[PDB]
Design a protein around this ligand. Structure first.
Ligand SMILES: [K+]
Ligand SMILES: [K+]
Ligand SMILES: [K+]
Ligand SMILES: [K+]
Ligand SMILES: [K+]
Ligand SMILES: [K+]
Ligand SMILES: [K+]
Ligand SMILES: [K+]
Ligand SMILES: [K+]
Ligand SMILES: [K+]
Ligand SMILES: [K+]
Ligand SMILES: [K+]
Ligand SMILES: [Mg+2]
Ligand SMILES: [Mg+2]
Ligand SMILES: [Mg+2]
Ligand SMILES: [Mg+2]
Ligand SMILES: [Mg+2]
Ligand SMILES: [Mg+2]
Ligand SMILES: [Mg+2]
Ligand SMILES: [Mg+2]
Ligand SMILES: [Mg+2]
Ligand SMILES: [Mg+2]
Ligand SMILES: [Mg+2]
Ligand SMILES: [Mg+2]
Ligand SMILES: [Mg+2]
Ligand SMILES: [Mg+2]
Ligand SMILES: [Mg+2]
Ligand SMILES: [Mg+2]
Ligand SMILES: [Mg+2]
Ligand SMILES: [Mg+2]
Ligand SMILES: [Mg+2]
Ligand SMILES: [Mg+2]
Ligand SMILES: [Mg+2]
Lengths: 171, 6, 38, 209, 142
RNA sequence: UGCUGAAAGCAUCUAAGCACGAAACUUGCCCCGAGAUGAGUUCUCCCUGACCCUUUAAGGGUCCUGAAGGAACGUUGAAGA
RNA sequence: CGAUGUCGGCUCAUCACAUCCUGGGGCUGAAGUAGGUCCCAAGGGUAUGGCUGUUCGCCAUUUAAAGUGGUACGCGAGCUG
RNA sequence: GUGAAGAGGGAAACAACCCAGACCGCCAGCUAAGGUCCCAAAGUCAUGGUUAAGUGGGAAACGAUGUGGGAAGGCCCAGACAGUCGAGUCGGCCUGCGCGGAAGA
């Protein structure tokens, strides 16, 4: 609605190919692709196609996705995670983040195609990529290994988290 | 024995 | 998770959402307010 | 991989130097001769047929003989098939020897169990006997109730009852290979395997890893 | 004058080939059932199989509406106590896609010897090829 | 439990899309299994003679022939009422 | 009512799930260990004795656990009495 | 009122419900209840709506930004409502159809 009725300005060094519903934004950082919903019509302006009930809702999604595809190729996305807890280290080797998270085994998260990662500190992971959905998924997967506990905040958190703690009862 | 005895 | 026939906003922070076809309450503030089966 | 067909010679033991007695079944595995190679084109699956041992020339029928003549092998006492895995390749006429198992730690052994004939539920199913005494009338080893009442008013399929026991294909899995003697055509496996002395055994590398 | 009766020894039966791709399962099956029984012929006779042979291609691409692809369940019982087994539509398509059409059509044919005989004239295939070029099937748009 | 995500400028695991998730389910393991009448496949073996008649047809006889194999009988079995 | 053998035990079960154990989860007045409570889950497992006709129960000692029900208060043309 | 003492058709099957009262024959026709995609006779009929739950094809208090319709109201280009901004927005009422509540051998 309001989101769909608000066009995506493509900047310089970006190119688009509308093969029906299929779209391919491509710039410096990479080449992203999406097949849009059949109810959406793109031109970047997004609008509902007639003979579909949920046209405006579907348009507003398609808008938001192609806006992130634009940020994908121009700027790229960055997600930062930090490892709170004694002995909790991290390190990268090619496309494999090796975490020590207080387990008896080593955790070695294989990164997907687009995403790279860097550990500026032992207690920080800074993954980067074009696809906003994919960085989000990698970050969630890393967080899942040792989610922040509510007593001392120990675990993998997003840098951005307010990790509510609580006291361990009276007595 | 009696079927259905008393 | 509270599983109940009656689900209701408890907090001002509680939000009603329908996921699949189940009414749920999600509260950012208090996880005691998380509910389903509305 | 493939397995081989052998004969149960009997059981013995191997004393180890460190004191242990290992009970072994001695399996005679003479050469398995490839008699046919099933292809994915002609047959729809990949396999080898093998023969082992020897049959009397007069007791091998003309159909049987012609099948062996095509292979170019001597008639054996039977024919068995082994599914080929991806990458395994064999030729018709190839003799496969017990050396196949030289670096195999565990095998599964398949044979026909000894035949107990018609067995009661005590033996066949480990039913509990009823009272020897305390008034039991003619119902010492009999199976007891075989169902409920009007609901369901029938006996359920698979109900455990008396019947033929043994004399059927059994596989014992994951038997340690104790020794492979290529010179004597022997395979020693730890522990008992199905069947009487003299009976045929199929030995395959263990499917559980 | 007695009413005409078809005679099995003189019944003319033609071959047809249908493409199930994208067709709604039940709306295809009724048309198959009709033609296998011979309800489309003037010579229709309840006790005689007057229908046609029908090859059905692309059974794996048959369509269903709603959430039937996940939620339509095929039950069967094995005969053993506790032996109630089930498969969703999508499972049935993956494993054994020709059964989907066949089960639909069989439910719509007369029960009894003649209904079983009528079913034998349906030749369902998962893909786009059949081995029946000898019978020279004509294309049927249903 | 999530990711991305509008409808609803926010938020939202869901509507479009994507991921994870249990001794349950489908497999994987073992056994039966083509009467699976939808009766499947592969390999090998065997038979390569004449005549007559009638209602002339997937017709019935006659003489010659008798295979591959099977069964039967016998000696039997760690197979078996 | 021209007879549908009637408690309990034994033998043999089979199903439901409102789950006793084992498996997966959410909340906790969840530090940990251990609990509470609710959700998913029926694959498999789920004592032996003393007392009593007992069902049940109490008790002893175990166990991962000693589930709750339906099946003519499952089962006497199967046994007991 | 029907059954009893009543057949036929419908309600899957079903004395007592719905339609309807069998003198006999017909390989004629029209209708009742009830029906018309296939089993199975007849509309894959027409036009306009609604529902997305297989609801239809079992159930309550009560719960809920499901979705359709209606009548009003507060606030708003002296810029609302949601996070400068630029058009609708908020919450109640009456109603249609759905959703949860919903465990058994
Ligand atoms: K007695
Ligand atoms: K066959
Ligand atoms: K009586
Ligand atoms: K818990
Ligand atoms: K269970
Ligand atoms: K029971
Ligand atoms: K009774
Ligand atoms: K009794
Ligand atoms: K009886
Ligand atoms: K008896
Ligand atoms: K009357
Ligand atoms: K329904
Ligand atoms: Mg024997
Ligand atoms: Mg005993
Ligand atoms: Mg006596
Ligand atoms: Mg005795
Ligand atoms: Mg019955
Ligand atoms: Mg009928
Ligand atoms: Mg958003
Ligand atoms: Mg009587
Ligand atoms: Mg439950
Ligand atoms: Mg089950
Ligand atoms: Mg009883
Ligand atoms: Mg007796
Ligand atoms: Mg009885
Ligand atoms: Mg007495
Ligand atoms: Mg009377
Ligand atoms: Mg009547
Ligand atoms: Mg009737
Ligand atoms: Mg009329
Ligand atoms: Mg009709
Ligand atoms: Mg219903
Ligand atoms: Mg309701």
């Amino acid at each position: 609605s309001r989101v769909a009725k608000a066009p995506v300005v493509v900047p310089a060094g970006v190119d688009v190919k509308i093969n029906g519903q299929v779209i391919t934004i491509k710039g410096k950082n990479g080449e992203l692709t999406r097949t849009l919903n059949d109810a959406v019509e793109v031109k970047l302006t997004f609008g509902p196609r007639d003979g579909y009930a949920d046209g405006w809702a579907q348009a507003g999604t398609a808008r938001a996705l192609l806006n992130s595809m634009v940020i994908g190729v121009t700027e790229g996305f960055t997600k930062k995670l930090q490892l709170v807890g004694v002995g909790y280290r991290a390190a990268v080797k090619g496309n494999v983040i090796n975490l020590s998270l207080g387990f008896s085994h080593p955790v070695d998260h294989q990164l997907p195609a687009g995403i790279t990662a860097e550990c500026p500190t032992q207690t920080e992971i800074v993954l980067k990529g074009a696809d906003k959905q994919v960085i989000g998924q990698v970050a969630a997967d890393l967080r899942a290994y040792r989610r922040p506990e509510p007593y001392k905040g120990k675990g993998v958190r997003y840098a951005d988290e307010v990790v509510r703690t609580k006291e361990a009862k009276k007595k | 024995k009696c079927i259905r005895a008393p | 998770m509270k599983v109940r026939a009656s689900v209701k906003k408890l907090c001002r922070n509680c939000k009603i959402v329908k996921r699949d076809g189940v009414i749920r309450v999600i509260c950012s503030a208090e996880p005691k307010h998380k509910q389903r089966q509305g | 991989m493939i397995g081989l067909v052998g004969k149960k010679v009997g059981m013995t033991r191997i004393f180890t130097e460190d004191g242990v007695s290992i009970p072994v079944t001695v399996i005679e595995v003479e050469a398995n001769r490839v008699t046919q190679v099933k292809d994915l084109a002609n047959d729809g699956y990949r396999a080898i047929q093998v023969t082992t041992g020897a049959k009397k020339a007069n007791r091998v029928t003309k159909p049987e003989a012609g099948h062996f003549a095509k292979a170019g092998v001597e008639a054996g006492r039977g024919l068995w098939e082994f599914r080929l895995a991806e990458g395994e390749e064999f030729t018709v006429g190839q003799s496969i020897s017990v050396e196949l198992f030289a670096d195999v730690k565990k095998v599964d052994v398949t044979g026909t169990s000894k035949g107990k004939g018609f067995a009661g539920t005590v033996k066949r199913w480990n039913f509990r006997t009823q009272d020897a005494t305390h008034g039991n009338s003619l119902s010492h080893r009999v199976p007891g109730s075989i169902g409920q009442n009007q609901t369901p008013g029938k006996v359920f399929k698979g109900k455990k009852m008396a019947g033929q026991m043994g004399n059927e294909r059994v596989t014992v899995q994951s038997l340690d290979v104790v020794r492979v003697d290529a010179e004597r055509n022997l395979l020693l496996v730890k522990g008992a395997v199905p069947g009487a002395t003299g009976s045929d055994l199929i030995v395959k590398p263990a499917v559980k890893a | 004058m007695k009413t005409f009766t078809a005679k099995p020894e003189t019944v003319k039966r033609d071959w047809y080939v249908v493409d199930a791709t994208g067709k709604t399962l039940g709306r295809l099956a009724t048309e198959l059932a009709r033609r296998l029984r011979g309800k489309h012929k003037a010579e229709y006779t309840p006790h005689v199989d007057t229908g046609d042979y029908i090859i059905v291609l692309n059974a794996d691409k048959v369509a269903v509406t709603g959430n039937k692809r996940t939620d339509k369940v095929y039950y069967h019982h094995t005969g053993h106590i506790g032996g109630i087994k089930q498969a969703t539509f999508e499972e049935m398509i993956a494993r054994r896609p020709e059964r989907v059409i066949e089960i639909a059509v069989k439910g719509m044919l007369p029960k009894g010897p003649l209904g079983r005989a009528m079913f034998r004239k349906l030749k369902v295939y998962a893909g786009n090829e059949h081995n029946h070029a000898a019978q020279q099937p004509q294309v049927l748009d249903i």
